[PDB]
Amino acid sequence: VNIKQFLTYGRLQELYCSVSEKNLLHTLLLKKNQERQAQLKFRFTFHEVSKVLKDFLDDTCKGFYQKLNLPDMDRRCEHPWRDLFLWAILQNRQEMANYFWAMGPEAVAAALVGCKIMKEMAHLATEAESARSMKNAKYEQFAMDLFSECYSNSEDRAYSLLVRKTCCWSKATVLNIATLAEAKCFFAHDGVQALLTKVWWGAMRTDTSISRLVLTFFIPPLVWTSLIKFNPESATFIRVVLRRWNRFWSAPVTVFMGNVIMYFAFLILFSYVLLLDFRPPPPYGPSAAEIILYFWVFTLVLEEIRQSFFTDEDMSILKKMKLYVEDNWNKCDMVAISLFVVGLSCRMAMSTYEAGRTVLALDFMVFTLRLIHIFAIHKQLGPKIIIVERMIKDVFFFLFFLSVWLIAYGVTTQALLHPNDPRIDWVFRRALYRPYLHIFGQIPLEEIDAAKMPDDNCTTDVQEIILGTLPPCPNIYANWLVILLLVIYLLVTNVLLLNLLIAMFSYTFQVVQENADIFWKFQRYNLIVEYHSRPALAPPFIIISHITQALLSFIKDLLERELPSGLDQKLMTWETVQKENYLAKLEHEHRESSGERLRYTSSKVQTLLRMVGGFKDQEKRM
Amino acid sequence: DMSILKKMKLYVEDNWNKCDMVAISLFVVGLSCRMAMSTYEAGRTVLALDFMVFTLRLIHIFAIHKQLGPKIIIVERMIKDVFFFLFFLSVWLIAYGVTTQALLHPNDPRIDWVFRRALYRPYLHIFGQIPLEEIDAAKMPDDNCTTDVQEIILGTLPPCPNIYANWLVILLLVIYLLVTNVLLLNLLIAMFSYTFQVVQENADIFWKFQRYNLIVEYHSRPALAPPFIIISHITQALLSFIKDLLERELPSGLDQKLMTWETVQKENYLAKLEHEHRESSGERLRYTSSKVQTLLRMVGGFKDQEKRM
Numbered sequence: 001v002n003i004k005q006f007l008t009y010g011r012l013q014e015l016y017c018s019v020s021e022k023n024l025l026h027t028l029l030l031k032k033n034q035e036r037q038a039q040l041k042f043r044f045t046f047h048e049v050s051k052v053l054k055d056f057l058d059d060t061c062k063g064f065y066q067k068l069n070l071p072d073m074d075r076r077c078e079h080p081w082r083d084l085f086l087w088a089i090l091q092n093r094q095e096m097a098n099y100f101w102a103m104g105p106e107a108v109a110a111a112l113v114g115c116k117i118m119k120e121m122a123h124l125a126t127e128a129e130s131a132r133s134m135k136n137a138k139y140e141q142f143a144m145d146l147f148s149e150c151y152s153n154s155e156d157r158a159y160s161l162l163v164r165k166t167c168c169w170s171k172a173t174v175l176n177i178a179t180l181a182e183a184k185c186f187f188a189h190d191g192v193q194a195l196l197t198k199v200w201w202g203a204m205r206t207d208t209s210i211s212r213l214v215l216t217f218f219i220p221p222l223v224w225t226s227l228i229k230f231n232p233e234s235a236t237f238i239r240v241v242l243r244r245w246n247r248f249w250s251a252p253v254t255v256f257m258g259n260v261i262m263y264f265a266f267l268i269l270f271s272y273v274l275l276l277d278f279r280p281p282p283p284y285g286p287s288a289a290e291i292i293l294y295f296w297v298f299t300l301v302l303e304e305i306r307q308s309f310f311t312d313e314d315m316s317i318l319k320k321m322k323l324y325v326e327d328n329w330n331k332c333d334m335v336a337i338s339l340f341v342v343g344l345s346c347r348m349a350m351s352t353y354e355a356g357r358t359v360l361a362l363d364f365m366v367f368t369l370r371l372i373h374i375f376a377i378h379k380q381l382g383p384k385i386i387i388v389e390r391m392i393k394d395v396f397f398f399l400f401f402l403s404v405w406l407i408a409y410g411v412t413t414q415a416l417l418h419p420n421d422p423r424i425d426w427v428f429r430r431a432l433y434r435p436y437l438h439i440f441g442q443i444p445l446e447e448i449d450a451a452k453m454p455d456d457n458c459t460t461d462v463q464e465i466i467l468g469t470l471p472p473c474p475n476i477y478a479n480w481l482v483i484l485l486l487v488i489y490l491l492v493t494n495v496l497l498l499n500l501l502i503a504m505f506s507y508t509f510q511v512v513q514e515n516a517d518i519f520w521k522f523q524r525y526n527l528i529v530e531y532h533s534r535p536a537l538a539p540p541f542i543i544i545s546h547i548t549q550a551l552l553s554f555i556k557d558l559l560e561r562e563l564p565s566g567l568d569q570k571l572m573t574w575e576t577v578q579k580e581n582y583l584a585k586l587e588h589e590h591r592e593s594s595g596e597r598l599r600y601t602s603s604k605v606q607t608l609l610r611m612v613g614g615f616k617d618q619e620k621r622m
Numbered sequence: 623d624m625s626i627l628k629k630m631k632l633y634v635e636d637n638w639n640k641c642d643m644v645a646i647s648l649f650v651v652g653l654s655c656r657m658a659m660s661t662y663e664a665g666r667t668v669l670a671l672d673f674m675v676f677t678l679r680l681i682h683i684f685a686i687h688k689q690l691g692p693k694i695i696i697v698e699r700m701i702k703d704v705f706f707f708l709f710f711l712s713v714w715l716i717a718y719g720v721t722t723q724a725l726l727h728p729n730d731p732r733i734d735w736v737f738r739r740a741l742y743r744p745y746l747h748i749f750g751q752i753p754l755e756e757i758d759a760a761k762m763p764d765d766n767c768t769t770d771v772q773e774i775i776l777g778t779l780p781p782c783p784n785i786y787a788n789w790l791v792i793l794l795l796v797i798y799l800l801v802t803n804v805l806l807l808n809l810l811i812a813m814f815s816y817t818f819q820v821v822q823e824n825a826d827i828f829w830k831f832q833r834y835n836l837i838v839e840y841h842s843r844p845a846l847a848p849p850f851i852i853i854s855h856i857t858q859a860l861l862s863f864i865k866d867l868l869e870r871e872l873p874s875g876l877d878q879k880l881m882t883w884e885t886v887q888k889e890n891y892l893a894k895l896e897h898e899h900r901e902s903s904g905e906r907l908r909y910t911s912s913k914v915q916t917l918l919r920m921v922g923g924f925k926d927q928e929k930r931m
């Protein structure tokens with residue numbers, strides 16, 4: 001059977017129409033068909049398949065079947081193994097999909113696509129057993145093992161395989177598909193990390209010492225010395241010195257360094273303006289340092305705009321905005337920008353001056369916390385960010401129990417101690433703020449224990465309590481009960497509930513620390529990619545880079561590169577050979593396994609018993 | 623006798639050696655400053671720090687005991703954990719402290735008090751020092767306070783804390799207490815627990831290496847303890863001018879006998895390894911499958927020959 005001749009588009013559509021009607025793919029195709037019928041022979045059509053694929057990849061299946069809209073039904077599929085793999089993946093058939101992947105040309109990209117589709121469908125997950133089998137798909141492992149084989153083979157063709165635009169997946173890069181699939185374990189591969197290190201250092205050699213690089217950063221003229229080794233490849237002298245300067249000052253590591261230093265400078269200036277040089281409204285004018293801070297934040301806004309609208313390429317504006325706002329650091333920045341603008345606006349008026357100063361203090365808090373993202377560069381600091389996020393989630397869930405318990409205890413103690421205090425603010429103080437402070441050692445027994453209550457001048461008159469002339473007299477009717485409740489609260493809260501939260505923290509830390517390497521390598525990938533696409537200048541100076549880019553656009557890649565047809569075909573054949581070698585080694589390993597040997601021995605012993613019995617009977621005939 | 627530079631490099635490679643060097647330098651600087659009236663207090667301060675260094679130097683003798691040795695390594699790794707935790711702690715404390723200083727004392731110009739309220743007070747919150755009389759308006763005393771900047775700088779009266787939005791200051795303090803005191807402190811403690819677990823898994827090996835190092839260190843030391851060690855030093859110098867348990871040179875016959883003995887021991891060890899490998903389950907399975915294959919082929923041939931008859 002020749003699959004190239006066997007699989008026509010009509011045949012493929014017939015296969016898509018022959019879905020068992022008990023699996024998720026049939027339901028999804030039914031929903032697509034119902035939507036199409038509402039908006040406007042074969043039960044299902046390639047339009048429905050394209051829409052279903054769009055709900056899992058949304059960029060990869062660009063005109064897989066919409067190109068001709070519908071293609072000729074007697075025409076053979078241009079990518080038969082790709083189509084068969086996609087069809088066998090959409091319906092949770094993993095063995096068949098494994099076979100189709102083993103016969104397919106672009107296997108790393110196919111495996112990453114399969115892992116993405118498996119996780120998205122396990123998010124859909126109509127059933128639960130299918131969802132569990134689809135959680136353990138092991139396609140990212142196929143991609144990782146094939147790429148390990150490829151990287152061990154050549155280590156230079158592996159990088160090109162990482163960055164080349166695929167032919168079977170609509171010019172999508174393997175790294176693009178891994179990002180779409182969120183394949184954290186693939187990004188943690190040694191080959192991917194090596195390519196990331198090569199991108200990180202740029203023109204310099206990756207073995208460059210940190211001390212030499214920092215010292216050359218702080219002494220720019222020393223870059224023309226041989227202190228920093230660079231990778232191979234009047235007017236000439238100027239050109240070569242400019243080339244050396246640009247190659248050093250364009251590397252993502254130096255851009256990162258400069259951005260970190262200028263962010264420290266920005267925080268220092270922000271703190272100076274907020275704490276020492278915050279002047280009255282424009283009647284007495286903002287200080288010059290404040291205007292410098294305004295310009296700095298304006299350049300930050302320009303950088304945000306560049307990242308949200310003019311990032312790297314041309315897509316839908318809405319798609320680019322969605323990609324921008326999907327990053328949590330991006331929305332953190334947006335919050336900081338909005339807070340600064342509101343603060344500045346309120347500060348410009350006398351009646352809102354204090355509110356503006358308050359909002360600006362909160363904005364400094366937000367910017368300082370924003371500074372945290374640079375810790376992903378270090379293995380010992382990166383994973384702790386993820387730990388802190390999960391631990392914040394743990395705190396959020398613990399807060400339900402804490403709030404219920406504190407409401408009960410605080411209202412009971414407020415009723416027992418100050419039944420005649422009408423003021424609501426003091427009600428909430430004594431009911432929640434004081435019990436919360438008990439957790440951290442703040443136990444004011446002079447307000448709770450009668451024997452410790454001072455002889456202060458106190459009133460029982462409600463009007464005098466409301467007026468605030470004298471503090472209310474605490475009720476000591478049954479003070480033993482108040483003290484017993486405080487003892488119980490101290491035990492329960494401070495030991496039991498606090499250590500329940502701490503045990504939750506410990507479990508979270510243990511779970512993240514088990515996978516610390518993978519998490520940090522994914523973080524490092526994201527940080528290196530972020531600073532590789534950034535302009536070489538740090539804000540405020542980034543205004544120069546923005547102006548230069550705009551002027552270049554008006555007047556007139558390391559990753560995701562397009563290859564010549566011959567080199568592309570050579571790479572595809574090389575990867576196919578690597579996949580064949582990997583599968584052959586897997587088969588050989590399987591054959592020599594203990595279970596396989598046991599099965600072979602038992603079967604052959606059975607055959608030997610039968611044939612030896614026959615031979616013995618024949619001999620006994622003689 | 624080696625290269626002088628090699629011996630110095632070997633000396634300074636030991637952390638206890640550089641600890642001692644720090645202690646000696648501190649004592650010398652302290653004594654020198656103490657010799658002058660204008661540097662007397664600085665000398666006393668440096669000598670106090672030197673006592674601290676010497677007392678911590680005393681820790682090295684704990685390697686002699688199995689229950690004390692490994693704890694030194696645990697403490698070193700835990701200090702590294704603290705160093706890495708300090709980045710998060712410093713960033714968070716800078717954010718919170720500057721925000722609260724701006725909210726509470728926007729008119730206080732003095733930088734020392736800025737840094738006090740921005741980092742020293744929030745750090746002390748971690749250890750139960752929560753002065754609500756400076757943060758909560760309802761707990762603020764009726765003390766005699768000024769809003770004049772000149773009077774604040776002069777120090778005549780304490781500055782009046784700003785109570786513009788005190789609910790926000792209190793909410794920030796509540797959030798800081800939760801985040802820092804529970805979350806971040808227990809993140810550091812979980813790091814500590816992981817470090818302790820990793821070292822305690824290999825406690826025996828670490829302590830035995832420590833014991834080796836300590837025994838070797840005190841085997842090569844002169845028999846007299848300082849100050850008295852001056853007598854041993856003078857005796858050694860006099861012996862050098864006028865005129866080993868480990869690392870000993872053997873006669874040629876005994877050396878050859880030892881080499882042959884070790885070769886025989888290695889041969890016995892390798893033979894036992896080979897015998898263990900042969901009788902393993904996997905090897906037996908491989909042998910049985912291969913011989914069953916051979917038996918199938920040869921029995922088929924024999925059966926065909928019999929069927930010829």
Ligand SMILES: C[C@@H]1CC[C@@]2(OC1)O[C@H]1C[C@H]3[C@@H]4CC=C5C[C@@H](OCC[C@H](CO)CO[C@@H]6O[C@H](CO)[C@@H](O[C@H]7O[C@H](CO)[C@@H](O)[C@H](O)[C@H]7O)[C@H](O)[C@H]6O)CC[C@]5(C)[C@H]4CC[C@]3(C)[C@H]1[C@@H]2C
Nearest residue numbers: 449450451452453454455476477479480481483484487488
């Ligand atoms: C292992 C486990 C640990 C936890 C726990 O169980 C065991 O421990 C138990 C111990 C127990 C507690 C044991 C004892 C008591 C005392 C008892 O009061 C007796 C009531 C009498 C009558 O009403 C009040 O007396 C008098 O009051 C006056 C004030 O009103 C004081 O005058 C002061 O007045 C003014 C003070 O402002 C000022 O003029 C002066 O300062 C002074 O003149 C007198 O001096 C004092 O004599 C109340 C109960 C209490 C606190 C127990 C509570 C429960 C425990 C904590 C257990 C735990 C589960």
Ligand SMILES: C[C@@H]1CC[C@@]2(OC1)O[C@H]1C[C@H]3[C@@H]4CC=C5C[C@@H](OCC[C@H](CO)CO[C@@H]6O[C@H](CO)[C@@H](O[C@H]7O[C@H](CO)[C@@H](O)[C@H](O)[C@H]7O)[C@H](O)[C@H]6O)CC[C@]5(C)[C@H]4CC[C@]3(C)[C@H]1[C@@H]2C
Nearest residue numbers: 402403406425428429432433436468759760761762789792
């Ligand atoms: C489970 C979880 C725990 C954590 C938390 O969430 C839930 O708990 C919540 C509880 C909440 C708090 C609940 C209540 C409040 C009170 C509120 O003030 C109301 C504002 C008004 C108006 O501006 C001020 O009032 C008045 O001020 C005056 C001072 O200025 C006082 O006069 C004093 O003046 C001088 C004091 O020097 C002296 O003359 C005397 O001593 C006295 O005359 C009055 O007596 C008082 O009436 C501010 C907010 C706060 C603290 C909440 C903050 C957030 C919580 C902790 C929640 C947690 C997330």
Ligand SMILES: C[C@@H]1CC[C@@]2(OC1)O[C@H]1C[C@H]3[C@@H]4CC=C5C[C@@H](O)CC[C@]5(C)[C@H]4CC[C@]3(C)[C@H]1[C@@H]2C
Nearest residue numbers: 399403407423424425426427428429432433789793
């Ligand atoms: C963590 C939750 C948030 C929401 C909430 O409980 C904790 O906060 C508390 C703060 C309370 C305020 C505190 C002070 C005052 C001033 C007083 O003159 C009138 C009542 C009012 C507004 C109170 C109304 C009820 C409020 C919002 C409580 C509310 C359930």
Ligand SMILES: C[C@@H]1CC[C@@]2(OC1)O[C@H]1C[C@H]3[C@@H]4CC=C5C[C@@H](O)CC[C@]5(C)[C@H]4CC[C@]3(C)[C@H]1[C@@H]2C
Nearest residue numbers: 708712716731732733734735736737738740741742
């Ligand atoms: C753990 C870090 C060490 C470094 C540092 O932050 C914590 O220490 C802080 C102590 C600060 C001092 C404290 C007191 C004074 C006296 C005052 O009249 C002038 C300013 C000055 C020197 C301050 C300058 C800034 C300093 C070094 C801060 C500096 C970022």
Ligand SMILES: *[C@@H]1O[C@H](CO)[C@@H](O)[C@H](O)[C@H]1NC(C)=O
Nearest residue numbers: 454455456457458459469470
């Ligand atoms: C309490 O107020 C009354 C009002 O007359 C006064 O006489 C008395 O001295 C006050 N006591 C205290 C402790 O302030």
Ligand SMILES: *[C@@H]1O[C@H](CO)[C@@H](O)[C@H](O)[C@H]1NC(C)=O
Nearest residue numbers: 763764765766767768778779
């Ligand atoms: C505060 O200082 C003024 C100066 O006249 C004085 O009259 C007043 O008694 C002082 N109050 C306190 C509480 O020291």
Ligand SMILES: [Ca+2]
Nearest residue numbers: 307329330333
């Ligand atoms: Ca951003």
Ligand SMILES: [Ca+2]
Nearest residue numbers: 638639640642
């Ligand atoms: Ca020494």
